[PDB]
Amino acid sequence: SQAFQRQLTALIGYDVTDVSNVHDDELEFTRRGLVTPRMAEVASRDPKLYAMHPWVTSKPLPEYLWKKIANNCIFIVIHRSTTSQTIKVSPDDTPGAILQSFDFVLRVCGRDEYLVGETPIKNFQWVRHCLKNGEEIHVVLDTPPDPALDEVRKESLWDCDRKFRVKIRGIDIPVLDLTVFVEANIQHGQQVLCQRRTSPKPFTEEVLWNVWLEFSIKIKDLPKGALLNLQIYCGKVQLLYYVNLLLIDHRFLLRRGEYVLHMWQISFNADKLTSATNPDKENSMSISILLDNPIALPKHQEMPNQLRKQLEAIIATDPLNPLTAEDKELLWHFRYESLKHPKAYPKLFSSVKWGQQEIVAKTYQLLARREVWDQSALDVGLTMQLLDCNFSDENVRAIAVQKLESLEDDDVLHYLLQLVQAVKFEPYHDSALARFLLKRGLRNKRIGHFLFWFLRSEIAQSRHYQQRFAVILEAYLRGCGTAMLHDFTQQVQVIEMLQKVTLDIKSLSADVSSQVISQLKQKLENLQNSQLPESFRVPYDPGLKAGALAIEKCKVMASKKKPLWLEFKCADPTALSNETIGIIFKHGDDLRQDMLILQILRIMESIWETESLDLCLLPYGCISTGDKIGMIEIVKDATTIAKIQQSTVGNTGAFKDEVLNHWLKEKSPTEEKFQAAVERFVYSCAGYCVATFVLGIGDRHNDNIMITETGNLFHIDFGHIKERVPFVLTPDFLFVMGTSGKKTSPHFQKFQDICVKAYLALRHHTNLLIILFSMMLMTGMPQLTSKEDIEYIRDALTVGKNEEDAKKYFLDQIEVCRDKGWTVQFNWFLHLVL
Numbered sequence: 001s002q003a004f005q006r007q008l009t010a011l012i013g014y015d016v017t018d019v020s021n022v023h024d025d026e027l028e029f030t031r032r033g034l035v036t037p038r039m040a041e042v043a044s045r046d047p048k049l050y051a052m053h054p055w056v057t058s059k060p061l062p063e064y065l066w067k068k069i070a071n072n073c074i075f076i077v078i079h080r081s082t083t084s085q086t087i088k089v090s091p092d093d094t095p096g097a098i099l100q101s102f103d104f105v106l107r108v109c110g111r112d113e114y115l116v117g118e119t120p121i122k123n124f125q126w127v128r129h130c131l132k133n134g135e136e137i138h139v140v141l142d143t144p145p146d147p148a149l150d151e152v153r154k155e156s157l158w159d160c161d162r163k164f165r166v167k168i169r170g171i172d173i174p175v176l177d178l179t180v181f182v183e184a185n186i187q188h189g190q191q192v193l194c195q196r197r198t199s200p201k202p203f204t205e206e207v208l209w210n211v212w213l214e215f216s217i218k219i220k221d222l223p224k225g226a227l228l229n230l231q232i233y234c235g236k237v238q239l240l241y242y243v244n245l246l247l248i249d250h251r252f253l254l255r256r257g258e259y260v261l262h263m264w265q266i267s268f269n270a271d272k273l274t275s276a277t278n279p280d281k282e283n284s285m286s287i288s289i290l291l292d293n294p295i296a297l298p299k300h301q302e303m304p305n306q307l308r309k310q311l312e313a314i315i316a317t318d319p320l321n322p323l324t325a326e327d328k329e330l331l332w333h334f335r336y337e338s339l340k341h342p343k344a345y346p347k348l349f350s351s352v353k354w355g356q357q358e359i360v361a362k363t364y365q366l367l368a369r370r371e372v373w374d375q376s377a378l379d380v381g382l383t384m385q386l387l388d389c390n391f392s393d394e395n396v397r398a399i400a401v402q403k404l405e406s407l408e409d410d411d412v413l414h415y416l417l418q419l420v421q422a423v424k425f426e427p428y429h430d431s432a433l434a435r436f437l438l439k440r441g442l443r444n445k446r447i448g449h450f451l452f453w454f455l456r457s458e459i460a461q462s463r464h465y466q467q468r469f470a471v472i473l474e475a476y477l478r479g480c481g482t483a484m485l486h487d488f489t490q491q492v493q494v495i496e497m498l499q500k501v502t503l504d505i506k507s508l509s510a511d512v513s514s515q516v517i518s519q520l521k522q523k524l525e526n527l528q529n530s531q532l533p534e535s536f537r538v539p540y541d542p543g544l545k546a547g548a549l550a551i552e553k554c555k556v557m558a559s560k561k562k563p564l565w566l567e568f569k570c571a572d573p574t575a576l577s578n579e580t581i582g583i584i585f586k587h588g589d590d591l592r593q594d595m596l597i598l599q600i601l602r603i604m605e606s607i608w609e610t611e612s613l614d615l616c617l618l619p620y621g622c623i624s625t626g627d628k629i630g631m632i633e634i635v636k637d638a639t640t641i642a643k644i645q646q647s648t649v650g651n652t653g654a655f656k657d658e659v660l661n662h663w664l665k666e667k668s669p670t671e672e673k674f675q676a677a678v679e680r681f682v683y684s685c686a687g688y689c690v691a692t693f694v695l696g697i698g699d700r701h702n703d704n705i706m707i708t709e710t711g712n713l714f715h716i717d718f719g720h721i722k723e724r725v726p727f728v729l730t731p732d733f734l735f736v737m738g739t740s741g742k743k744t745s746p747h748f749q750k751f752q753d754i755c756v757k758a759y760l761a762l763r764h765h766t767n768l769l770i771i772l773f774s775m776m777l778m779t780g781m782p783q784l785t786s787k788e789d790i791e792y793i794r795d796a797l798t799v800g801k802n803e804e805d806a807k808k809y810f811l812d813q814i815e816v817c818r819d820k821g822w823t824v825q826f827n828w829f830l831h832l833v834l
C-alpha cells in the first residue's frame with residue numbers, strides 16, 4: 001500500500017511525507033502541483049525512443065573530426081555471436097539506412113547505448129567519441145528493449161494601504177556574555193527594500209521584546225517572492241543567526257498569524273536565501289513572531305545621441321560591473337529602448353523598484369511586449385543571469401526558463417548541474433525552473449539519470465535545501481519508470497555499501513599496514529555474496545554496467561584520507577575490452593566542489609569545439625554522494641607528476657627537468673606513439689593551463705596534477721582553493737616540448753598558439769563563464785563568496801581589453817611560469833611534504 005513510499009524514501013535519502021519541519025503546506029502543495037507536468041510528460045514521450053535513449057547532437061562535426069575522416073567513409077563493425085563483419089558507411093547514413101546492408105537494433109558493444117532514430121550516424125555521441133580517440137566503432141545486432149519495463153505505476157492586497165509590521169515576540173536558545181538585537185529585512189533578490197531593528201537586550205537563554213516593528217513599505221507594495229529576513233547580531237557587530245519567511249505565500253496570500261522559526265548558525269551564500277527552517281528543534285536558536293496586517297494578491301493583464309551611448313556602454317559592461325543609481329534611472333526611463341536588447345535584460349530588471357506596486361505593474365506590462373526576447377537566438381549566459389540570486393520575480397525568471405525550452409538534450413546535460421543548483425535561488429518550491437528540470441528528466445533517461453544523482457547529492461548534505469530538492473526528486477521518480485526505479489535502487493544499495501567500507505577502513509589507520517589490506521579484502525568478500533547486487537550502473541557513466549569486484553586489484557591508497565581503489569568487472573558479456581571499471585571511493589574531500597569545476601571544464605571543451613579546437617582535457621567522472629564523501633572515476637594508465645619525480649630523484653625537491661620526457665619515452669612502444677604522446681601533452685598542458693588560470697586554481701602542487709601513459713595531462717582534486725604562479729608550467733613540462741630554460745621549439749610555439757587561441761576563445765564567452773563562476777561560488781563554496789572572490793575572474797579574463805592586449809597578457813603568464821621555474825613547486829614540497 002504505502003510500501004512504495006518507503007522505497008522512494010530510501011531512494012531519495014529524506015522523507016518527503018514528513019511534516020515535522022513545516023510552518024505551512026508549501027511542500028505538500030508542490031508535490032500535488034507537480035503531478036500534472038509529470039503525467040503530461042509521461043503520456044507524451046515516445047515510448048520507443050525513451051527506452052533506448054539515443055544520445056545525439058545537432059552541433060556540426062568539428063574540424064578535428066573531419067580531417068581524421070577518410071574518403072567520406074567510416075567503418076562500423078557489426079557483431080552476431082562469435083564472428084563479426086565490417087561495413088562501409090557514409091557520415092550521413094541513418095541507422096534505418098544501415099538495415100539494407102546487414103526488426104532489430106544497433107546497440108554499442110559493451111554498453112547500454114543505442115544507435116537508433118532519425119539522425120545521421122555522425123550525430124551520435126559515441127560515434128564522435130570513437131573518432132576522437134581513434135577507436136573502432138563496435139556494435140551488436142540486438143533486440144530493441146521493451147517499453148513495458150519503463151511502464152509507470154498509476155498515480156485584495158492593492159486595496160490595502162496599511163504599512164507592513166512584524167511583532168517580534170522574542171528569541172529562544174536552549175543553551176549558550178554580551179548584548180543581542182534582532183534585525184528584520186524585507187528582501188527581494190539580494191536587495192534590502194526596508195530595514196528595522198530592535199533594541200539591544202542582554203543575551204540570555206531567553207530574550208523577549210514584544211515590539212511592533214512598523215516598516216515604511218505598505219502591504220500593497222510588497223512583491224511576490226519577498227522575504228522577511230530575520231537576523232541576529234551580537235554586541236562590534238557580528239552576525240549569528242538567520243531565518244527567512246515568504247511574505248506572500250504559494251497561494252498569493254499575505255502571510256498571517258503566529259510563527260516560531262528555528263534558525264541557522266554561521267561559521268553571498270545560497271544557504272542564506274532558503275525558506276527552510278533548521279530541522280534541529282533541540283539545539284538551534286528560535287524566534288517568535290506575529291503577523292496580522294484574508295488579503296490576497298491580484299494578477300496582471302526617440303532618445304538623444306549622448307544618452308544612447310551612455311545606455312549602450314551600460315549594456316556593454318560585464319555582469320559583475322555594479323549599477324549606480326544614475327545608471328538604473330537611465331535604464332528604467334528608457335525601458336523601451338532597453339527592451340530591444342536582450343543583453344540589457346539583467347541590468348534592466350535590476351533597475352526596477354520592486355518595493356513599488358505601480359512600477360512592478362509597469363514592468364509586467366513591459367514583459368508582455370517581448371517580441372525581441374522571444375525571437376532572439378538563445379544565449380545561455382544571459383539566460384543563466386536571470387536565474388541567479390539577483391532575481392526573485394517569477395515572471396522575470398520564467399522568461400529565462402522559456403529560453404531554456406529550446407535546448408536539445410545534449411545541451412541540457414552540459415548545464416544540468418548548475419541548473420539544479422539554481423533551484424537554490426528560487427523563492428518558491430514550485431517554479432518554472434523546477435518544472436523544466438522535471439520534464440527534461442522524464443523525457444530522457446540520461447538527463448533523468450544525472451538529475452537523480454545531482455538532486456540526491458544535495459539532499460544528502462544540504463539541510464537548507466534538502467526538502468525542496470526531495471520534493472522534486474520524488475516528483476521525478478514517480479514517472480521515470482519501473483526499470484529506472486530498479487536501476488536507481490541497485491545503485492543506491494551498492495554505494496551505501498561501499499561508503500560504509502570506506503569509512504570503516506579510514507578508522508583503522510592513524511601508512512597502510514599489512515593487515516588493513518586483508519581487512520579490506522575481507523569486508524569486500526563479505527559483500528560479494530550478501531547482499532551486493534552483481535550488476536549496477538556506474539553513476540558517472542550510466543552507459544556502463546559494472547559487475548563483480550576485482551578483489552585482487554582493490555586497495556587502500558597511501559594518503560592520509562585513506563581512499564578506496566576499487567576495480568570492477570564489466571557486467572556486459574558483449575564487452576570487447578578486458579579493462580576493469582575503476583572507481584575511487586573517498587571521504588574527506590568536498591567532491592561537490594570537484595563536480596562544479598569538472599562541469600565548467602566540460603563547458604570550456606564545448607566552447608573550444610565551436611572554434612574547432614580540442615585541448616584533450618580529461619574531466620573525469622565524479623559524483624558527490626554525501627558530506628565530504630563520493631566517488632571518482634579512475635583514469636586508467638595514469639600517475640601523478642610528483643611520483644614520477646620521486647621514482648627517479650626521491651624524497652627531495654631537487655627536481656630534474658629530464659625525468660618526465662624519459663618517463664614518457666619508456667611508456668611509448670614506438671617513436672610514432674612517442675610523438676603522439678608528446679603532442680597529446682602539448683595540448684593537454686595548454687588546455688589545463690588556460691582553464692585553471694581562468695578559474696583561479698592554476699597554482700597547484702604537482703601530485704595534484706596527473707599524466708596518462710599516452711601524454712594526457714590532467715589536474716585532479718579541486719577541493720578547497722611567499723609569491724605565487726598563474727598556473728603550473730614547470731621546466732619538466734617545457735623539456736617535453738623541446739625547450740630548456742629560455743628557448744623556443746616547434747612544440748613550444750605550438751603550445752603558445754594553442755594557449756592564445758583557447759584563452760581568447762573563452763573570452764568570447766566572458767559573460768557565461770562569469771555567471772557560472774559566480775553561481776559556483778555561491779552554491780558550492782561555503783568557505784568563501786565575498787564580492788571580491790567573484791571579481792577575480794574579471795581580471796583573469798581581462799574584461800574591457802582588446803584581443804591583442806589580452807593575447808600578450810597571457811603570453812606574460814607563460815613567461816612568469818618560466819621565470820619562477822621550480823620555486824613554487826619547491827615551496828609546495830617544503831609546505832605539504834614537510
Ligand SMILES: Cc1nc(N)nc(-n2c(Nc3cc[nH]n3)nc3ccccc32)n1
Nearest residue numbers: 589620632633634635636638716717718
Ligand atoms: C581522476 C583520477 N584518476 C586516477 N587514476 N587517480 C586519481 N587520483 C585522485 N583523484 C581525486 C579526485 C579528487 N580527489 N582525488 N587522487 C589520487 C591520489 C593518488 C593517485 C591518484 C589519484 N584521479
